Curated annotation (Swiss-Prot), chain A:
Origin: domain of life: Eukaryota
Keywords from the named record: Electron transport, Membrane, Mitochondrion, Mitochondrion inner membrane, Respiratory chain, Transit peptide, Transmembrane, Transmembrane helix, Transport
Subunit-structure text: Complex I is composed of 45 different subunits. Interacts with BCAP31.
Spans traversing the lipid bilayer: 36-56
Name this polypeptide is given: NADH dehydrogenase [ubiquinone] 1 beta subcomplex subunit 11, mitochondrial
Membrane topology: Single-pass membrane protein
Subcellular location, record wording: Mitochondrion inner membrane
Cellular-component GO terms for this entry: mitochondrial inner membrane; mitochondrion; respiratory chain complex I
Keyword Lyase attributed: no
Swiss-Prot record, chain G:
Origin: domain of life: Eukaryota
Portion held of the full protein: 558 to 606 of 607
Organism from which the protein derives: Mus musculus (Mouse)
Family to which the UniProt record says this protein belongs: Belongs to the complex I subunit 5 family.
Segments crossing the lipid bilayer: 29-49
Assembly with partners or alone: Core subunit of respiratory chain NADH dehydrogenase (Complex I) which is composed of 45 different subunits.
Protein name (record): NADH-ubiquinone oxidoreductase chain 5
Task of the protein: Core subunit of the mitochondrial membrane respiratory chain NADH dehydrogenase (Complex I) which catalyzes electron transfer from NADH through the respiratory chain, using ubiquinone as an electron acceptor. Essential for the catalytic activity and assembly of complex I.
From Swiss-Prot, chain J:
Membrane-spanning ranges: 23-43, 60-80, 90-110, 113-133, 147-167, 194-214, 224-244, 257-277, 284-303, 308-330, 350-370, 392-412, 434-454
Lineage: Eukaryota, Metazoa, Chordata, Craniata, Vertebrata
InterPro entries: NADH4_N, NADH_Q_OxRdtase_chainM/4, NADH_UbQ_OxRdtase, ND/Mrp_TM
Keywords of the record: Electron transport, Membrane, Mitochondrion, Mitochondrion inner membrane, NAD, Respiratory chain, Translocase, Transmembrane, Transmembrane helix, Transport, Ubiquinone
Enzyme Commission designation: 7.1.1.2
Name of the featured protein: NADH-ubiquinone oxidoreductase chain 4
Main function: Core subunit of the mitochondrial membrane respiratory chain NADH dehydrogenase (Complex I) which catalyzes electron transfer from NADH through the respiratory chain, using ubiquinone as an electron acceptor. Essential for the catalytic activity and assembly of complex I.
Enzyme class: translocase
From Swiss-Prot, chain L:
Domain of life: Eukaryota
Keywords: Electron transport, Membrane, Mitochondrion, Mitochondrion inner membrane, Respiratory chain, Transmembrane, Transmembrane helix, Transport
Family: Belongs to the complex I NDUFC2 subunit family.
Transmembrane portions of the chain: 57-76
Species in which this protein is naturally found: Mus musculus
Gene Ontology, cellular component aspect: mitochondrial inner membrane; mitochondrion; respiratory chain complex I
Keyword flag Mitochondrion: yes
Subcellular location, record wording: Mitochondrion inner membrane
GO biological process: aerobic respiration; mitochondrial electron transport, NADH to ubiquinone; mitochondrial respiratory chain complex I assembly; negative regulation of non-canonical NF-kappaB signal transduction; negative regulation of reactive oxygen species biosynthetic process; positive regulation of ATP biosynthetic process; positive regulation of mitochondrial membrane potential; proton motive force-driven mitochondrial ATP synthesis
Protein name, entry field: NADH dehydrogenase [ubiquinone] 1 subunit C2
Record's function text: Accessory subunit of the mitochondrial membrane respiratory chain NADH dehydrogenase (Complex I), that is believed not to be involved in catalysis but required for the complex assembly. Complex I functions in the transfer of electrons from NADH to the respiratory chain. The immediate electron acceptor for the enzyme is believed to be ubiquinone.
Membrane topology annotation: Single-pass membrane protein
Principal subcellular localisation of the protein: mitochondrion
Length: 99, 52, 63, 50, 344, 140, 49, 46, 39, 459, 320, 119
């Protein structure tokens, strides 16, 4: 047979670092890494991200659109016009081909 | 050519005895001197696609 | 900033790109005409040099 | 202390460099600054809109 | 070999192509080719072993026949027009014989069978020259006559070269034969784009040279003429993997790397000329080159092979081989896509 | 004089079946002659008899390929009035691959050639119709 | 779905690889092949013209 | 402490000086060239 | 466990004159390591 | 956009000239800050889209992909940490650099305007993935897996390039929205049909069609967890983005040159959801789940309706998050048992009583439990295909059933039996991986609360 | 500046220094013969240099700080274990033979470069021309396999011919019972477990292959124990020696130059010892290899290149 | 292609017809990228020679950067000249051949009837 090291063996971590957190064997580094994770992902992004996104105004005009639609319905129902026609473009300016 | 170092330095190593209308030693004329002279002089400046 | 900035910036981008497109499609046809007619500055294939022809008497009248 | 804590000047410097290059890009593309058929204003309160 | 002999032989090796490219007279071009041949043979045969002698013999015979055919073409043109330069009036047979001869001089298929044998029998610093510096004069002679060539036979030669290069590199386990078939493929690309745009032939030429020189230097670092020998590079010199892998991917022609641009822009021009079917065939068959380059990237940089013991003493020893050109050319060849509009 | 192979495309498919099959058969024979010359010069044999037998094998094989392809195509165009349909050439290519598999005694080769030659012939016809050019001249 | 696409690709290309790389270093055969090439090219030219 | 005292035990001050001088001269010539080209451009175009 | 790394069985398949030896005419043998044949 | 890309480019030096103890921490924190900054793209107060340059642009369809890409990074950092822990500092810095390069290229190709830039980046995404899968896998078939992945992709991508050139020549640009304001109808000829095939097959391969799905299960099973995550979340989305962007010019061909792919998708959906019932490898099960879910995306792009595209985008993002979550959950066990076999370890939820919840919710999502964006996508795809033809509901219901079956199978054969009491090596749950699962879930809650950021172009 | 074409053109040539006694001599024999003493005395009486026998730590001693290294960093082999338990299923026997051939080759080179740059002749102990006797002995005894033997012969063919042979070969002949007695007296709990069969196989290899093979290209001088220990006879024989029949006369300045380049580049020396022939006795796995290499580079004075390790007192690392 | 044109000087890097174009600025992204490549070449040279990357050969790295920027400036000038010449010739030909470059008769969408395609 040939030269090679033998398969290693499982290694409990809690035996030496019962306060283990998952990141590094060095306890202080483990702790500061988990702290950085929790303070930059949870305490900031999710919180301030949610805040900013929630207070983005008029996302894609879905609010101005409702306001303007109310204005239009009022104008039209008041002046007897209909609320919406069957042709977007006025068929006057258009010039159809004659067969 | 591919690298006009000759024309760059304004010299002549190989481009003076190419064709028949060139300079012969004791002014000896070549056979088709006039025909070739005319062809060249008429194709000068419009090279290739036109001259063909 | 307001939306007018993005609006006008998009308009300028569109201008630039449309100009590029016109120029490319004109380049193709110009190159085609030049390759097929030899009437321009490109694709002017070479010819012999008339400066090396001899224009002196030749020891015989007929050439 | 610097040899281990000077690496905190790169990524924010990168953010600022990015903002600066965006500023350059929009200093370009200046055309149509007020020639849009929708936002043609009259320059009454200022000298440059965008 | 003493300094005087070295100087004379290498000055001739350098002068050959220079005359070829700086001369208007086809006779002087032929002279340059003969210089190249004469001055290359001794370097091939330096080691004086049966394999090198056989390689030299094959090279000599092939190149000499090719030169004779080229000179026949020249003589026929001379009887036909009185001038020593091809014009728009030479019988196309003359030019097709000339193209066959130039293709055998280069190593294109189906005139390629000699290239792998010779390169194998030859050392590394000689394959480098044979595959980079000895492609410049025969390609120049073609660049000078690109308007009056036969696209049909050119494209047939190019596509045959692509195909056979792929189907050779798939099987060869020897560095030098792999390089030979890669040369065949890239020269096929060159010929393909030649009659439409030769600036791109020259582009791909310089790209392939920048990509090949540093690879042969990498090899010469340990004289690893084999896959199982270059696999030990992780224990001998592992600071070369990050660059061997990238240069091989560039050769293969992977998008984000210099080596891509040649294929891309050549395909563009062929599309403008309605050579889309040929461009498609070539682009699909380059993936085999990419395949047998990935198979080497694996054995070199993405998995460790069974090593040896005396490699320990090899580690003990120091080294001063890889001069600055290695790094310079590898960087220029791997990280220069953002500058493609200038190289075009 | 090269018009033997141009008489194939002077009439819609479904006509002149006999001469069309003759043309495809000549094409097969030529391709086989070239292949056999190459395989005889490289990778040669022992006896000139075995060599000429290799030649005959390859030539008759390719000739059968071409004959079956052309005949099946024109027969499909006959039984169905569709002279501008690449499906006929696909069927012909599959028949050619079938004949190749019958000769070489390999269902693998049979189906592989079927698919490949079918695509090849269909794309050939598509080019003929649309206006594709193979080996075109420079225009940039 | 393995037998069809990838295994077929591999088989095809390995077989053509063997074909094209079954070469023995015989200059006679290489040059006979070169001669076949010359003949084919001359014929293409003289035929199409 | 080694036993084969190498070539690199101390720096090549000639190479150092030449490199630094070449760099400084490159930058000086580059600045001068750029400024001169700008001056010529503006002379030609107004 | 741990990362599997090639063994002799996996590395000796790159050691023949040519890969994919599906041929029966490929009686060849690896060339020398110094290009000096045996005699 | 450059304020998003330059810092991602600077994460590299940080990584290399950071000390061997603070590189993970620093790069993860700054990656989180990048994810944060990427939310500028969500400031869309008008129906006009963003255009920062001639080279970059953002849309309601590219913004979510970009933010998910910038969010997944620190999660992959955290997940690739327990393994390659003993590996050398240099090797793990290499790993981090690979991850960062993937991030940058994916952001670029989502923010791109030109199809050819999109192409070079969608094809440069191969190098880091191949390297991660081959240099850090544990089996011996990762090499063949990389071969399959690489070459499927390239074989699909070449004709796309050729079609892009043909277009760049006919039209004078490959620029988006110009290809829109100038698009013409076509002639319904065979050349244009082959143009369609070319433009499409690349993306139909990068998101596995039924018949060419034979690179995803391999790559997953043989790849590490970060590779698995990115492959499941974004690399399967490049195809969707590309098709949603390229289908605008191929009109009106997809009305009839799309049937085969709709059929293959609606059938392979069933034929993979069923494999998810009798596969033994948890990772391959989840891979086939990804396939059965991307089939819907394909069939919904094919029919070109607003509801269809909306559902496609919703399901894209939702499946990204959920698949990453499930992969990390299986990895938590693998790290403890070194076997992907599902029926080996059982009776959990006794020693890991909390991770049994994450296991459960990731399953509630995959089987489309309302209210959820998985369902808000599936439902609209179903409605669009029912308007297309009412007989699709049959196959949709069959797939729904099989999904509800194999999700709970995966739950019960791992967490809801009785324990394999002979398992001494069940190290308790790490805060790190619990945080992974929480970071995966919470954004799903938030996107279920505000699914206006996830509809897409139409809405 | 380094030696090369330029130095050889400028005047750093060879033939300007080949004074008589610019030779290379070997003092071979059996194991416990007076080789060290005789060779030191010859070196003194002829002004030449002495290169002692090369073992498992020759490279560790010639490179770096000069101190030895763990056996896993230099050799992974043990002569003690070879004498204690041959036939082992580990591979120590051939894994030791190969490393010792490599070290003897490195030593031959380190001596040739010294002899060519400086005319000071050299005297060595058993060399690459005689290492094979200890291999043939093990093969005839059953400690090694024909595969290992063929691997050894192949590396020998690849390496040896590129080197010049010795001028004078002194063979100190001694019989196996006297050798065993000398071993018991000297005292070594492991050497004292060796076998007269092995010793006689060594002697027979010597007399039947080495002497014939070498008397045709270098002057042989065979002596016994009592002619030895009276060295002046040996030294005067050498001084009288005629130096024909060798290739050293076919050599000019430029052959010497192209040999000095090889001998100076210590990696083209071992490229062929490092061939990937996969013997289970030397084939090291990737994990073991990587661990050993990374630890070797972790060690001091070995991480970076010689003039670039500050932890050992290297300054100016920012300008060289 | 553009070699054989009137007013063509052989083997010249930069004629005087190019001194009228605006020169590139040293802050140009391409020059900066060439500087980056120089620095990376230095670092790779060290990494291959087994020296401390980023802590060795400062003069070497400086030389690399300087040479790269130097070559880039001039090569960029040249390529800009070439592109300008290309546009020049193209527009000149367009102006001398008005018979093959006619202004399109661009209509308005109110007249041309484009076909409609449901779903
Ligand atoms: C788009 C990018 C995609 C990439 C994903 C990765 C994201 C990583 C970045 C971090 C996340 C950044 C922000 C995520 C979006 C946050 C949305 C938000 O801010 O909430 C807005 C909402 C008010 O919504 P608004 O639009 O202002 O008014 C109209 C009605 N929506 O106001 C709120 O509701 C906020 C209050 C939250 C309270 C949560 C209560 C939970 C209720 C339980 C619901 C359970 C439903 C799910 C159950 C099944 C799930 C399995
Ligand atoms: C931004 C846009 C993105 C555009 C697309 C980007 C394309 C993808 C980028 C690919 C770059 C890397 C590709 C090549 C992979 C190289 C594989 C490799 O080098 O790692 C293997 C090897 C491990 O060696 P080993 O013996 O196992 O132990 C460590 C001892 N060095 O490693 C080595 O031994 C290396 C040599 C050791 C030298 C000392 C360490 C110095 C660092 C050298 C590595 C530098 C890598 C730079 C990575 C930058 C990534 C962008
Ligand atoms: C201690 C941890 C620190 C983390 C931050 C804590 C506060 C929470 C903030 C999160 C909410 C904001 C997230 C979105 C930020 C994107 C907005 C933005 O950056 O705007 C760009 C702005 C540059 O503005 P500009 O107009 O381009 O130039 C004028 C210069 N006065 O540039 C800026 O205004 C810079 C914004 C900083 C982003 C971080
Ligand atoms: C294991 C799988 C097999 C792997 C081996 C692959 C073998 C490659 C196939 C052999 C080559 C056959 C293709 C030849 C291309 C012919 C040219 C063509 O089809 O282009 C036509 C079209 C543009 O035409 P149009 O614009 O209308 O006008 C005329 C041109 N100006 O432009 C186009 O349509 C571009 C067409 C490009 C080629 C498309 C190939 C088929 C696409 C669908 C399948 C893609 C998967 C890979 C190929 C599978 C086998 C075909
Ligand atoms: N190639 C080899 N294989 C096995 N053993 C070897 C080899 N080379 C040397 N040895 C061992 O090295 C030892 C050399 O001891 P030796 O008696 O030569 O000491 P010494 O210092 O040379 O003294 P002296 O010169 O008087 O003999 C022997 O026991 C021998 O077995």
């Amino acid at each position: 047979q040939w030269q090679e090291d033998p398969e290693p063996e499982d290694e409990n971590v809690y035996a030496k670092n019962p306060d283990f957190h998952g990141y590094d064997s060095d306890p202080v580094v483990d702790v500061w890494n988990m702290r950085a994770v929790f303070f930059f992902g949870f305490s900031i992004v999710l919180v301030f991200g949610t805040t900013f996104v929630a207070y983005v105004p008029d996302y894609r005009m879905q609010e101005w659109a409702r306001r303007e639609a109310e204005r239009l319905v009022k104008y039209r129902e008041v002046n007897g016009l209909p609320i919406m026609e069957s042709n977007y473009f006025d068929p006057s300016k258009i010039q159809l081909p004659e067969d | 050519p591919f690298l006009d170092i000759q024309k760059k330095l304004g010299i002549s190593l190989d481009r003076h005895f190419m064709f028949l209308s060139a300079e012969q030693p004791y002014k000896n004329a070549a056979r088709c001197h006039a025909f070739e002279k005319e062809w060249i002089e008429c194709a000068h400046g419009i090279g290739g696609t036109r001259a063909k | 900033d307001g939306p007018e900035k993005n609006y006008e910036k998009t308009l300028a981008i569109l201008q630039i790109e449309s100009e590029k497109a016109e120029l490319r499609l004109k380049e193709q046809e110009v190159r085609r005409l030049m390759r097929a007619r030899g009437d321009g500055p490109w694709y002017q294939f070479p010819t012999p040099e008339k400066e090396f022809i001899d224009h002196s008497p030749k020891a015989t009248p007929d050439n | 202390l610097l040899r281990e804590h000077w690496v905190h000047i790169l990524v924010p410097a990168g953010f600022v460099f990015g903002c600066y290059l965006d500023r350059k890009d929009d200093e370009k593309l200046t055309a149509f600054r007020n020639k849009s058929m929708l936002f043609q204003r009259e320059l009454r309160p200022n000298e440059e809109v965008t | 070999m003493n300094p005087i002999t070295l100087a004379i032989i290498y000055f001739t090796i350098f002068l050959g192509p220079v005359i070829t490219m700086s001369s208007t007279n086809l006779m002087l071009m032929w002279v340059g080719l003969e210089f190249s041949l004469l001055a290359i043979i001794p370097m091939l045969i330096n080691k004086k072993n049966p394999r090198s002698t056989e390689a030299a013999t094959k090279y000599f015979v092939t190149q000499a026949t090719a030169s004779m055919i080229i000179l026949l073409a020249i003589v026929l043109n001379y009887k036909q027009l009185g001038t020593w330069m091809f014009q728009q009036q030479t019988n196309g047979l003359i030019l097709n014989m000339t193209l066959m001869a130039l293709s055998m001089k280069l190593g294109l298929a189906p005139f390629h069978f000699w290239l792998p044998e010779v390169t194998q029998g030859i050392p590394l610093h000689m394959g480098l020259i044979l595959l980079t510096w000895q492609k410049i004069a025969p390609l120049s002679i073609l660049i000078q006559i690109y308007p009056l060539l036969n696209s049909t036979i050119i494209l047939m030669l190019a596509i045959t070269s692509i195909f056979m290069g792929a189907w050779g590199g798939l099987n060869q386990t020897q560095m030098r034969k792999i390089m030979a078939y890669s040369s065949i493929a890239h020269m096929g690309w060159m010929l393909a784009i030649l009659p439409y745009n030769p600036s791109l032939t020259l582009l791909n030429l310089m790209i392939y040279i920048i990509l090949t020189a540093p690879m042969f230097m990498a090899l010469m670092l340990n004289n690893s003429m084999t896959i199982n020998s270059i696999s030990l590079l992780w224990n001998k010199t592992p600071a070369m993997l990050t660059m061997i892998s990238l240069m091989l991917l560039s050769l293969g022609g992977l998008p984000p790397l210099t080596g891509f641009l040649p294929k891309w822009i050549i395909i563009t021009e062929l599309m403008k000329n309605n050579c889309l079917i040929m461009a498609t065939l070539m682009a699909m068959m380059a993936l085999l080159n990419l395949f047998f380059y990935t198979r080497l990237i694996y054995s070199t940089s993405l998995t460790m092979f069974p090593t040896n013991n005396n490699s320990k003493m090899m580690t003990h020893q120091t080294k001063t081989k890889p001069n600055l050109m290695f790094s310079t050319l590898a960087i220029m060849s791997t990280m220069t896509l953002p500058l493609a509009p200038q190289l075009i | 004089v090269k018009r033997f192979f141009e008489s194939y495309h002077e009439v819609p498919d479904g006509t002149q079946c006999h001469r069309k099959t003759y043309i495809t058969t000549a094409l097969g024979g030529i391709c086989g002659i070239i292949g056999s010359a190459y395989s005889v010069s490289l990778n040669p044999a022992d006896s000139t008899l075995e060599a000429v037998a290799r030649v005959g094998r390859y030539t008759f094989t390719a000739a059968a390929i071409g004959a079956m392809f052309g005949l099946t195509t024109c027969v499909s165009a006959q039984v169905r009035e569709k002279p501008d349909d690449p499906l006929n050439y696909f069927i012909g290519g599959c028949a050619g691959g079938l004949t190749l598999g019958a000769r070489t005694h390999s269902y693998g080769t049979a189906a592989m050639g079927c698919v490949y030659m079918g695509t090849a012939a269909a794309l050939f016809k598509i080019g003929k119709l649309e206006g594709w050019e193979l080996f075109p001249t420079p225009k940039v | 779905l393995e037998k069809t696409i990838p295994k077929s690709t591999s088989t095809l290309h390995t077989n053509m690889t063997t074909l094209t790389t079954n070469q023995k270093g015989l200059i006679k055969l290489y040059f006979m092949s070169f001669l076949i090439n010359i003949i084919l090219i001359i014929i293409l030219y003289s035929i199409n013209l | 402490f080694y036993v084969r005292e190498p070539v690199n035990a101390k720096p090549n001050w000639l190479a150092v000086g030449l490199s630094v001088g070449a760099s400084v001269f490159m930058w000086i010539y580059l600045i001068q060239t750029h400024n001169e080209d700008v001056l010529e451009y503006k002379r030609r175009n107004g | 466990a741990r990362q599997w790394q090639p063994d002799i069985e996996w590395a000796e398949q790159f050691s023949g004159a040519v890969m994919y030896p599906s041929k029966e005419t490929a009686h060849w043998k690896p060339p020398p390591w110094n290009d000096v044949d045996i005699l | 956009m450059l304020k998003i890309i330059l810092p991602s480019l600077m994460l590299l030096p940080l990584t290399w000239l950071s000390s061997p103890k603070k590189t993970w921490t620093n790069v993860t924190s700054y990656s989180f800050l990048i994810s944060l900054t990427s939310l500028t793209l969500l400031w869309q107060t008008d129906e006009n889209y963003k255009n920062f340059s001639n080279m970059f642009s953002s849309d309601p369809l590219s913004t979510p992909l970009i933010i998910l890409t910038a969010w997944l990074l620190p999660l992959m950092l955290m997940a690739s940490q327990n393994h390659l822990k003993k590996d050398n500092n240099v090797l793990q810095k290499l790993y981090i650099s690979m991850l960062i390069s993937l991030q940058i290229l994916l952001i670029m190709t989502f923010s791109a305007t030109e199809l050819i830039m999109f192409y070079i980046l969608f094809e440069a995404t191969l190098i880091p993935t191949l390297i991660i899968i081959t240099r850090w896998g544990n089996q011996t078939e990762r090499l063949n897996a990389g071969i399959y992945f690489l070459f499927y992709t390239l074989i699909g991508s070449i004709p796309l390039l050729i079609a892009l050139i043909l277009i760049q020549n006919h039209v004078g640009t490959l620029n988006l929205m110009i290809l829109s304001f100038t698009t013409h109808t076509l002639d319904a000829s065979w050349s244009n049909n082959l143009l369609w095939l070319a433009c499409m097959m690349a993306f139909l391969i990068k998101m596995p069609l039924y018949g060419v799905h034979l690179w995803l299960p391999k790559a997953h099973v043989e790849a590490p967890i970060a590779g698995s995550m990115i492959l499941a979340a974004i690399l399967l989305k490049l195809g969707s983005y590309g098709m949603i962007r390229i289908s605008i010019i191929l009109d009106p061909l997809t009305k009839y040159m799309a049937y085969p792919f709709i059929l293959l998708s609606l059938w392979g959906m069933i034929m993979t959801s069923s494999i998810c019932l009798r596969q033994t490898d948890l990772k391959s099960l989840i891979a086939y789940s990804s396939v059965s879910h991307m089939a819907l995306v394909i069939a919904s792009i094919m029919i070109q309706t607003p509801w269809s595209f909306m559902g496609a985008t919703m399901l894209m993002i939702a499946h990204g998050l959920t698949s990453s979550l499930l992969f990390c959950l299986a990895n938590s066990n693998y790290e403890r048992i070194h076997s992907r076999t599902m029926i080996m370890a059982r009776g959990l939820q006794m020693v890991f009583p909390l991770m049994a919840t994450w296991w459960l919710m990731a399953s509630l999502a995959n089987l489309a439990l309302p209210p959820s964006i998985n369902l808000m996508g599936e439902l609209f795809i179903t409605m669009s295909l029912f308007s297309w033809s009412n007989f699709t509901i049959i196959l949709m219901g069959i797939n729904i059933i099989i999904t509800g079956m194999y999700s709970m199978y995966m739950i019960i054969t791992t967490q809801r039996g009785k324990l394999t009491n002979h398992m001494i090596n069940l190290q308790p749950s790490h805060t790190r991986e619990l945080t992974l699962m929480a970071l995966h879930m919470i954004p799903l809650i938030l996107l279920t609360t505000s699914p206006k950021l996830i509809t897409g172009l139409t809405m | 500046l380094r030696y090369g074409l330029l130095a050889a053109i400028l005047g750093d040539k060879t033939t300007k220094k080949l004074h008589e006694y610019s030779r290379v001599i070997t003092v071979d024999g059996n194991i416990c013969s007076g080789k060290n003493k005789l060779a030191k005395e010859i070196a003194q009486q002829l002004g030449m240099k002495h290169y002692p026998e090369a073992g498992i730590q020759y490279s560790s001693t010639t490179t770096g700080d000069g101190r030895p290294l763990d056996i896993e960093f230099s050799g992974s082999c043990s002569l003690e274990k070879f004498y204690d338990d041959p036939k082992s299923n580990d591979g120590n026997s051939y894994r030791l033979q190969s490393w010792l051939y490599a070290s003897r080759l490195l030593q031959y080179a380190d001596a040739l470069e010294h002899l060519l740059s400086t005319g000071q002749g050299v005297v060595l102990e058993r060399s690459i021309y005689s290492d094979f006797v200890f291999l043939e002995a093990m093969y005839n005894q059953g400690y090694i396999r024909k595969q290992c033997v063929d691997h050894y012969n192949e590396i020998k063919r690849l390496t040896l011919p590129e080197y010049l042979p010795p001028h004078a070969v002194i063979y100190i002949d001694v019989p196996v019972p006297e050798v065993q007695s000398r071993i018991q007296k000297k005292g070594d709990p492991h050497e004292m477990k060796v076998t007269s069969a092995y010793l006689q196989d060594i002697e027979n290899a010597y007399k039947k292959t080495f002497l014939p093979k070498m008397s045709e290209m270098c002057e042989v001088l065979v002596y016994d124990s009592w002619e030895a220990e009276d060295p002046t006879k040996v030294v005067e024989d050498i001084e009288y020696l005629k130096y024909n029949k060798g290739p050293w006369l076919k050599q000019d300045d430029w052959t010497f130059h192209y040999l000095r380049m090889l001998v100076q580049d210590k990696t083209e020396v071992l490229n062929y010892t490092t061939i990937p022939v996969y013997l289970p006795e030397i084939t090291i796995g990737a994990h073991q290899g990587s661990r050993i290499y990374n630890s070797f580079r972790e060690l001091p004075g070995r991480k970076y290149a010689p003039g670039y390790n500050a932890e050992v007192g290297d300054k100016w690392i920012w300008l060289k | 292609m553009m070699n054989g044109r009137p007013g063509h000087e052989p083997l010249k890097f930069l004629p005087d017809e190019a001194r009228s174009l605006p020169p590139p600025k040293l802050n140009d992204p391409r020059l900066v990228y060439m500087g980056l490549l120089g620095y990376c070449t230095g670092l790779m040279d060290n990494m291959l020679r087994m020296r401390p990357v980023m802590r060795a050969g400062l003069h070497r790295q400086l030389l690399f950067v300087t040479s790269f920027v130097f070559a880039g400036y001039f090569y960029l000038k040249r390529q800009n000249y070439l592109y300008a010449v290309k546009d020049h010739d193209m527009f000149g030909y367009i102006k001398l051949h008005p018979e093959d470059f006619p202004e399109k008769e661009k209509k308005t969408y109110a007249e041309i009837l484009e076909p409609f395609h449901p779903v």
